[PDB]
Design a protein around this ligand. Sequence first.
Ligand SMILES: C[C@@H]1C[C@@H]([C@H](O)CC2CC(=O)NC(=O)C2)C(=O)[C@@H](C)C1
Lengths: 52, 179, 187, 160
Amino acid sequence: AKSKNHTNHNQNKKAHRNGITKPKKHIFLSMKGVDAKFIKNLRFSRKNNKRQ
Amino acid sequence: PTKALGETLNEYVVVGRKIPTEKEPVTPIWKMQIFATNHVIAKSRFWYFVSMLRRVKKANGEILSIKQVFEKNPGTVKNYGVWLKYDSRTGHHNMYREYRDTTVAGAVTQCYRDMGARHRAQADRIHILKVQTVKAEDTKRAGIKMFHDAKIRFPLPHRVTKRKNLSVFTTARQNTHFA
Amino acid sequence: GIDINHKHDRVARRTAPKSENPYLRLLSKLYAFLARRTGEKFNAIVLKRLRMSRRNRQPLSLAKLARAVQKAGNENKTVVTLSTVTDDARLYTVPKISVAALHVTEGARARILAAGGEIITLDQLALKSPKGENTVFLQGPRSAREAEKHFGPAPGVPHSHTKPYVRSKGRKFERARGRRASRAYKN
Amino acid sequence: TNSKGLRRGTRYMFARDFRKHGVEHLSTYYTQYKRGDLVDIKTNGAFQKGMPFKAYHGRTGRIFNVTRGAVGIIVNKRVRGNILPKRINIRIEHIKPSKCRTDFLNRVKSNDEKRKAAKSAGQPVPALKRLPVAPRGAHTVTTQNNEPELLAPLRFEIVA
RNA sequence: UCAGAGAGGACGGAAACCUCUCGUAGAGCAAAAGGGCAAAAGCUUGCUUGAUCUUGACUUUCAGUACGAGUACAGACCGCGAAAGCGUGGCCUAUCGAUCCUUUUAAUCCUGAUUGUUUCAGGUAAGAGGUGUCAGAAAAGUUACCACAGGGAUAACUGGCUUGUGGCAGCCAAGCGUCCAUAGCGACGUUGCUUUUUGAUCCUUCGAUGUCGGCUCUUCCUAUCAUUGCGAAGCAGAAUUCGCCAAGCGUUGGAUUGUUCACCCACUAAUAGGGAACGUGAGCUGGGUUUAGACCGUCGUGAGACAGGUUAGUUUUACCCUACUG
RNA sequence: UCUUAAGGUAGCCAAAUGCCUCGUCAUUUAAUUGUUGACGCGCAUGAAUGGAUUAACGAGAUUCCUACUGUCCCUAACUACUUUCUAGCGAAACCACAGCCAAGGGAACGGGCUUGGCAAAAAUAGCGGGGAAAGAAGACCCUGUUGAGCUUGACUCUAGUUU
RNA sequence: ACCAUCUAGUAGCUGGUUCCUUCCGAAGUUUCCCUCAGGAUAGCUGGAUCUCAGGCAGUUAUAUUCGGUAAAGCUAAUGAUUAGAGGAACCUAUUCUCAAACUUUCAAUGGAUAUGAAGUUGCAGUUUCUUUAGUGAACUGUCAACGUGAAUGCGAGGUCCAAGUGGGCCAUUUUUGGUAAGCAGAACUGGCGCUGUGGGAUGAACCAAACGUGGAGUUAAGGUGCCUAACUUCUCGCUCAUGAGACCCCAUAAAAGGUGUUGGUUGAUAUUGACAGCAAUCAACUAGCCCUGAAAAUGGAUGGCGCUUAAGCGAGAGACCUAUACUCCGCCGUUGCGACAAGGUCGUAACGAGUAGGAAGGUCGUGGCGGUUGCGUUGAAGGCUGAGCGU
RNA sequence: GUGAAAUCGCUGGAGUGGAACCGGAGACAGUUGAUUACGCCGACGGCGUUGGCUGCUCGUUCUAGCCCGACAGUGUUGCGUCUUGCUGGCGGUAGUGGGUUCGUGGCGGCUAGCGUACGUCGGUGUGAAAGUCGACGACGUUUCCGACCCGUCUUGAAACACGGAUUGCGGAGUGCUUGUCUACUGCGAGUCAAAGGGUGUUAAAACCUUGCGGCGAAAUGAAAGUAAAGGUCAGUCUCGAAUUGGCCGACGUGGGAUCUGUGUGUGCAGCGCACCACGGCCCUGUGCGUGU
RNA sequence: GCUUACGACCAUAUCACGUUGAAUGCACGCCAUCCCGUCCGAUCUGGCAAGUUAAGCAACGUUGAGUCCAGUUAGUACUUGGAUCGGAGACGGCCUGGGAAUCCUGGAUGUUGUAAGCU
Ligand SMILES: C[C@@H]1C[C@@H]([C@H](O)CC2CC(=O)NC(=O)C2)C(=O)[C@@H](C)C1
């Protein structure tokens, strides 16, 4: 009663059933994982710029 | 695959050439005589043969002209010689065949039918190298030669005639001999 | 045979309030007529919010109403909301507010009327501004629900701040393994 | 089943090109990378540090971080029915500027310059759209010194 | 600058050490394989402890969980270097571990709730003690005295596909055949056929298709033992061999063995080979196999095991439909 | 010469114990994988886990001679009671629907399906080819984190007993 | 042992699981589990909807890239491996044949990214980061100008709740184990499972084509001598078989042979008369049909009957037949949109497969309760059964 | 009391060749309807729509042949560089002139289904009844086509896989506790109120009644404990991990249905809900780290 | 037309043999007290300027090897998609599109930036 039976038969069809979802367009706006020193300097710069 | 469909294949003259490029601003013009059912097939076979013979394919070339050729005088009988190359189930062979007809296109159609009948060869496995008109004394096939006689005579021995628009049954006697 | 997909042919929608309230149904009728005839997206919005479920109409705060009215140019416009207008104890000064709403709580109504304001119904709003002229459309915060706190990525996945479903709160209720590095890991 | 090591099946992928081994030329380090730029990933086997994973080899990504000698890149990866924008910190040696985006930028620059010049000179706004190559137009071909050659199929010859 | 090669030098030789040329890596880099590396990642050597403290982000497996491993930074304190720089272990790809509990280190820390002091105990943070079935129960057999829920997801008998093996038939001729490859054979090779061998598979059947052999009785096929009609011989004839048309008709009595097979005795025209659910158990028998009793040998501490031997061990139902006989 | 605690002694044997095996020789027969008597490097005989014998006894296993016979060549005849027919009485098993075949394909052995062969009431007595006929949720095999009897060097306990 | 109770003991296992229509509609795959007949997990699916009104796409174009398979190479490295040649080994230049764990080189299919408003130019501020340095980097501003920059198609996005599934099987191509297998294991895609319909005599998968209920017309695959709707229709050849042949998967056939017949290739002789006997011939080949090779058991299969200038084989031509397919016409319903002062009516365009499963409608049906509307000894319920109504 | 189905007997009709049942389409038997205009049916015309078959006639594309001239050949009549024939390209085309191709062409002929720009007319029906006409024809009979037994596990069932002889009646996702989401209702920074008490005689109901209780309004830490207001402008300064004062007060930016203003379906500008994205601050724990 | 320092691309630049080399320069070169390092002033390090283009280096030469580019190989090999295509099969061709690489042939033999200098 062998029961390993791996396959990839219908998986592409299942994936395309609902369409392949491309990544959003705001992912490039976040500064997550950016250099800590650069982020610190950016925070200081943003804190001080005079609005008018 | 390619098939010689249609009674009395048409004959076309096709002229084409490779599309000029910077390195080859002027290209040679090629011309062929092709027997095909219609001009689309004519162009297809033209490109087939031209791609076989010269380094050019349909993508890189163009068809300057495609024209149909009509028999000059279909009121006279000629002997036609056909040089062809064909592939059997085992090997490739060259054949020379002879036909009698009032049109070269008719002779080529006869050639296709005869090859199909005698060698079970289809149109896709046959290349027509050459077609010409042979004189009476330059023929070399007995079937054609036996008809080069001004005194030719023969009856119609056993004529089975088919009734067309009548009942299947009749009281008439059927006669196959007509002296 | 035609090669098309029918999975999304039908779109779920509310063509009338699920509520059996006769007055709500009458308001829906009136504003369906108004939207169909005047052809105003304002009336369409009012109709849709009338037919919405109560989950989508979170209560609105008198503080928000006052903030909307105090903005430059909004002093005389009528605030229209299909959300209940509640009273805000943290609000000390209430300006003059003209509001059309389904329901206004006792304290909010008392404060609005005392401050010289006016409260009308949706049919009175229809008579006043049939096309929604001089209006300020407002609603309560839709995502501010304890239920919404539990929605999102599962609590046990990285960078997730979803609230778990816990029997109680304390050191003994899902605070040991997978929540601190001293126990296996932390996410 | 296969082992799931990091460099399984990279025998030829991470190898150097023939007669191309050795010291790494310094334009690789002199090249300028800025956040928002597009870069192609091609692993350099000679640098075992900061290597990209085999699944990102030959893929193009966008830089989001610039460190001392590496860059953070956002590369699209297919996982079932979603495309994930994975973030990878790759060293400079495995990175090469992408030319598609710079070509597009050049085209946009040319479009703007042509539009500005035409507007200033009073000309009509010119066409600034790429068009698919249209079918060939009408022309004439001359046979002078180029007479057509009659071609026929050749007979079969036994080539021993 | 390696592996190695060439050419020289007391004892010194094929091989000790010294010298000069050439030497794209043909060496070495802890280990398996594969990548990588030449003023190095290799060899020699100096100094050192970045194999240290701290938090996040990310890659790999992936559910985009955890562990493990790794990547690029940020803060501290350091090492080497003249310096730029490099360094969080090993040139890269494997070399490893949750909860609970114990134990250790850390704060001049928190708690023991009648007030305090000191022991003691318990906590917060980071390690170690181990789960190798490695996302991690604490675990020896036998049953033929056996039982239950199921399984044709799964074996033993038939049937189905396959035909390695078994059997049978062809093609070229090196040779045998006193001489002569083909009368009759035919090696080295090679082409097929068959399912009366045994295998391979696991498609049907485990709310059961009664599982060996013999007896009895039909019919069928031939790859023809005999007989009929013929052709060819290394055919002068009892005799014998090959081949063709040919399954019309025959192919027996016995000793031993449960035997199918096997072997022998005798007669005979001949003592041909096979199928029909390895034909045939509501046709028989029950000798064997194949429950429970019992004995021996070997094995086991033992219960017990043994296609090892031996003895004894219940064979049910047709009156229904069809077929067949009248 | 290696080597054990000791290295199977007296006996006995192809045995109810020997695989190879239908062991080899003789005896019995026309013919014997059988019987008996011998041989013994005995896969794996053996001395109260008793060895070797043994008169008498045995519904115990085995071989042979004689007598006897229908076991057989090869069947036949007869008797009683059935079956048979009649009067009276009168069930049960089983039953998806039903019941002629060949081949095909199909869950790889059809009563139904496809193509053919065919196809004429209602019945009596037999029959055992088929209905993969009926009896029973396979007593064989496997699975189950299902049992039970028994054993012990399994884990954890315990009556009792000694101190 | 038996009796009662704990006890309706537990079962990842077997069996059953009861009305109608409408709409949508799967999976046998990933990871973890003393896990492999089971679960959890992601995937596939339904429903509720909500926010909006151009950015997307199982498709191309342009631009740029990745790869080391087919092919190619070993007279290029490594590993095999035949033979000599020029100076027994050795050297040189060669040579025959090879590589899943060789390669200089290297496709086709294939993968990825980009193709403007979230953009391009400037001006004018911030920074403790960076630089010798306005030197850069980044950001900020209700800054100023410019205005949609390939094709085709098309409305897009978000959240929540939850089912079933987690035995698969078949086929073209590629491919590993095996002698092979209707065997075992994989890759892409399409199917059956879940699915009917025309054709292949018959068949889960083959060819055509997918389905409301009807009609007319036309077809796909397949066919037209009779079964059987459609021609013994038209043209040219080949074939005689003492059971020929007859249509994808498909239902077996080979090596080797024929002086059967039909075409071709090559080489010779021949009219200074070619072969046989006292006017073409000879020889070797070649490939169509036919024949031998070709033996199995109940009587049997181009599906059957039969068919021989065919009703066979090959090339073709007209016409004709036939689907739940295509066009048009009516009706039913769903969906989208819309009109109307209505929990409704109507209009309009497209659409209608379905197992497991999910929703909706039900003036479908049954028994009560609070109310409401009525009928009944001039006959209620119950029972048997004609005229109608509703899919 | 009623008196079903299965099963069974009789009378009459009808079928009856190794199953029977069943779907589609007719016919028969049978059942049922039927007030000049109108109903129920038919025929012939017209019109609309979708067609099917079949002819002429213009032209268009590419092309000849007949006809004429020279040359070359010969399957050649009649009597040899003869002649008559015939063929081949080549050159001409006046005249004549067919093939092939189709046209945003022109003109016809026959005929079908569906519907009714609508006409011309026949059958029948107006007291029964009989007849006639119309419609059905349902588990009756007969024909042509199709047609394997359901439920179930299964990759696969008509299966030589299991359950099922027949009929009636009964027969299986429930109750409750606890969660979560969703829909509806009331109130809303509150809401619900418990046990209980007061009342209530169509008194287990209904009605009234809560310093206090549940949930919510504040989190965080193991705990001791601590516990959520800043924006902008302008100052002093020991120029720093300082301080002071006003105004505003729930932060900033981008996108935002709607609204407002203004141009020309569309554009620009302003205030911006919910929501989304990117940040900023504040509370608590902890590491580093200072001081005033 | 050149030399040097620092480079970029990393053989069209490499390798073999040979000719030439004006000026700067580079280089060889002399010495070893001192700094510095060795068994050894060979290397490294320091102080110099008698001598040489001998070598390095640069330019040039070779029917030079290598490398690079192009042609040919060739519309060939291979390959996407199609067929109720041929064949017992192995396989083969046709339709529709992509499309190589050896042998062989021919050509090229570094380009160039910053700074300083010679002519
Ligand atoms: C660290 C390792 C494990 C530890 C201990 O046995 C593990 C526990 C785990 C658990 O949850 N329950 C238990 O009863 C055992 C121990 O003493 C040694 C073997 C060492």
